[PDB]
Design an enzyme around this catalytic site. Structure first.
Site, PDB file in Angstrom:
ATOM      1  N   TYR A  78       6.710   4.414 -21.420  1.00 12.51           N
ATOM      2  CA  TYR A  78       5.805   5.004 -20.419  1.00 12.51           C
ATOM      3  C   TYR A  78       5.061   3.875 -19.712  1.00 12.51           C
ATOM      4  O   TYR A  78       4.998   2.740 -20.177  1.00 12.51           O
ATOM      5  CB  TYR A  78       4.826   5.989 -21.065  1.00 12.51           C
ATOM      6  CG  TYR A  78       4.042   5.420 -22.212  1.00 12.51           C
ATOM      7  CD1 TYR A  78       2.806   4.816 -22.002  1.00 12.51           C
ATOM      8  CD2 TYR A  78       4.504   5.473 -23.517  1.00 12.51           C
ATOM      9  CE1 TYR A  78       2.081   4.292 -23.032  1.00 12.51           C
ATOM     10  CE2 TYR A  78       3.801   4.935 -24.571  1.00 12.51           C
ATOM     11  CZ  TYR A  78       2.566   4.351 -24.343  1.00 12.51           C
ATOM     12  OH  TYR A  78       1.863   3.847 -25.398  1.00 12.51           O
ATOM     13  N   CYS A  79       4.440   4.257 -18.601  1.00  9.12           N
ATOM     14  CA  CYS A  79       3.586   3.342 -17.837  1.00  9.12           C
ATOM     15  C   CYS A  79       2.287   4.091 -17.479  1.00  9.12           C
ATOM     16  O   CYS A  79       1.597   4.562 -18.373  1.00  9.12           O
ATOM     17  CB  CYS A  79       4.352   2.695 -16.653  1.00  9.12           C
ATOM     18  SG  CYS A  79       5.045   3.866 -15.479  1.00  9.12           S
ATOM     19  N   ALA A  80       1.967   4.152 -16.170  1.00 12.32           N
ATOM     20  CA  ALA A  80       0.805   4.906 -15.669  1.00 12.32           C
ATOM     21  C   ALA A  80       1.292   6.263 -15.150  1.00 12.32           C
ATOM     22  O   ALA A  80       0.914   7.289 -15.699  1.00 12.32           O
ATOM     23  CB  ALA A  80       0.068   4.122 -14.605  1.00 12.32           C
ATOM     24  N   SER A 106       3.023   9.712 -18.986  1.00  7.40           N
ATOM     25  CA  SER A 106       2.549   8.356 -19.092  1.00  7.40           C
ATOM     26  C   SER A 106       1.023   8.313 -19.267  1.00  7.40           C
ATOM     27  O   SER A 106       0.400   9.293 -19.651  1.00  7.40           O
ATOM     28  CB  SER A 106       3.088   7.516 -17.932  1.00  7.40           C
ATOM     29  OG  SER A 106       4.501   7.302 -18.077  1.00  7.40           O
ATOM     30  N   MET A 107       0.422   7.126 -19.058  1.00  8.30           N
ATOM     31  CA  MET A 107      -1.007   7.022 -19.358  1.00  8.30           C
ATOM     32  C   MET A 107      -1.864   7.851 -18.429  1.00  8.30           C
ATOM     33  O   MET A 107      -2.974   8.247 -18.806  1.00  8.30           O
ATOM     34  CB  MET A 107      -1.445   5.556 -19.412  1.00  8.30           C
ATOM     35  CG  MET A 107      -0.898   4.810 -20.602  1.00  8.30           C
ATOM     36  SD  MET A 107      -1.467   5.511 -22.318  1.00  8.30           S
ATOM     37  CE  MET A 107      -3.350   5.162 -22.124  1.00  8.30           C
TER      38      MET A 107
END
Ligand SMILES: [Cl-]
Length: 120
Positions: A78-80, A106-107
């Site tokens: 995951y990322c943002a 994600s975040m």
């Protein structure tokens, strides 16, 4: 099979299990990771290290500063907002990681649902 994907509630469960054979791969940049991150996750920045998951173990640690994750584990990417996480998952799955998954939300999803206020 379809890449396994996880919702917020699924991730909360996974974090709470503390499974030794699961790796939480946050591919945001270090500055983003320092703002907030899931405890016990690792940071393998995609923008600044897009090839990270194609590196051999020795070179991975030289470039990233942490050990290369064990390919026998489930790596959850995951990322943002999800794009970089998806890209990194493709690198890993193409370079010897047979057990990979996504946290698409994600975040952004994690923080939207208050995950940063948990202590699991
Ligand atoms: Cl590992």
């Amino acid at each position: 099979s379809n890449i396994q994907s996880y919702s917020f509630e699924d991730m909360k469960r996974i974090v709470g299990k503390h499974d030794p054979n699961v790796v939480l791969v946050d591919v945001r940049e270090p500055s983003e990771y320092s703002i907030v991150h899931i405890p016990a996750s690792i940071n393998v920045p995609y923008r600044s290290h897009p090839d990270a998951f194609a590196l051999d173990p020795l070179e991975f640690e030289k470039q990233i500063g942490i050990p290369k994750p064990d390919s026998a584990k489930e790596l959850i990417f995951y990322c943002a907002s999800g794009k970089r996480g998806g890209e990194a998952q493709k690198v890993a799955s193409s370079h010897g990681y047979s057990n990979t998954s996504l946290y698409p939300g994600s975040m952004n999803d994690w923080v939207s649902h208050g995950g940063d206020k948990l202590d699991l």
